[PDB]
């Protein structure tokens, strides 16, 4: 396989945002994703800061402890799947992702064809991770949860 | 600013450093000890080095680690322990936390000569997830260990 884009990347709260898919991947630990033969694809946000992210991170970091649901929804057929994508790394580097089922889902219409594809973000403080207010070390408050959409077309598993 | 602890260590495919400052505010409330209860704010600064064995780039924050420290006041005798937490500032992110050291209650965290430790966990005890196919795949995670400072503490500097 390879790593397909999945429309335009967006910046936005400090942030590039972007969707990208490649073929299903083999994950530990065990059990917690969809096994790759299983699946079709692996989706992932790329998600990093931008210069001047006003809560502290300095540009290209990893954003972490997002929480990132995603709905995938052939327009065509009207079929419609959603999940979160868990945080996760590979060799170049950490990323948010999952294993989908697309041809290999017999509970939809899943297969080849023109998708809209949403990621509703949260901030970190979702799960916790804290943040200086104090002025001497503080940072700006996070953005509010918020959706980014995504049109593009599946052609099939990266072969 | 920043008072480093010790010398820093390199391992497992991070850099391990710690240092300490004066106390900070911390949002959301009723996790970390309160400024005003607190003499310093210790931070481990965890960063991966070249050809990290799991994937990160260099520099990058090591994320999702579960840390807890110890620190020991070799002259009295007193040690406290406690649990780092994941947190930014102006300077990124870290793991921190507000700690009692004169303002302690129980005595003897005052100024003198310390050693700290940390216990550290990989990121998978929090779920996080490796690639491990031939392609994009990395190598098995660390086990937990510790690391070891020895500094002196000459006072709260707020
Ligand atoms: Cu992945
Ligand atoms: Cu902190």
């Not at 033969?37 to 990093?48: F, G, W, Y």
């Not at 403080?125 to 940072?139: A, I, N, P, S, Y």
């Amino acid at each position: 396989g390879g790593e397909v884009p999945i429309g335009d990347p967006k910046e936005l709260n400090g942030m590039e945002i972007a969707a990208v898919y490649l073929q299903p991947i083999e994950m530990e630990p065990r059990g917690i994703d969809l096994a790759a033969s299983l699946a079709d694809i692996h989706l992932e946000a790329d998600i990093h800061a931008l210069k001047n992210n006003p809560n502290g991170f300095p540009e290209g970091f990893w954003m972490p402890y997002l929480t990132i649901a995603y709905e995938l929804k052939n327009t065509d057929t009207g079929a419609i799947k959603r999940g979160t994508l868990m945080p996760m790394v590979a060799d170049d580097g950490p990323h948010y992702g999952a294993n989908i089922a697309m041809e290999k889902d017999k509970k939809g219409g899943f297969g080849v064809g023109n998708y809209e594809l949403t990621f509703y973000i949260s901030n970190p403080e979702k799960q916790g991770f804290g943040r200086h207010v104090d002025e001497e070390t503080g940072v700006g408050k996070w953005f509010e949860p918020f959706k980014v959409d995504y049109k593009f077309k599946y052609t099939g598993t990266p072969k």
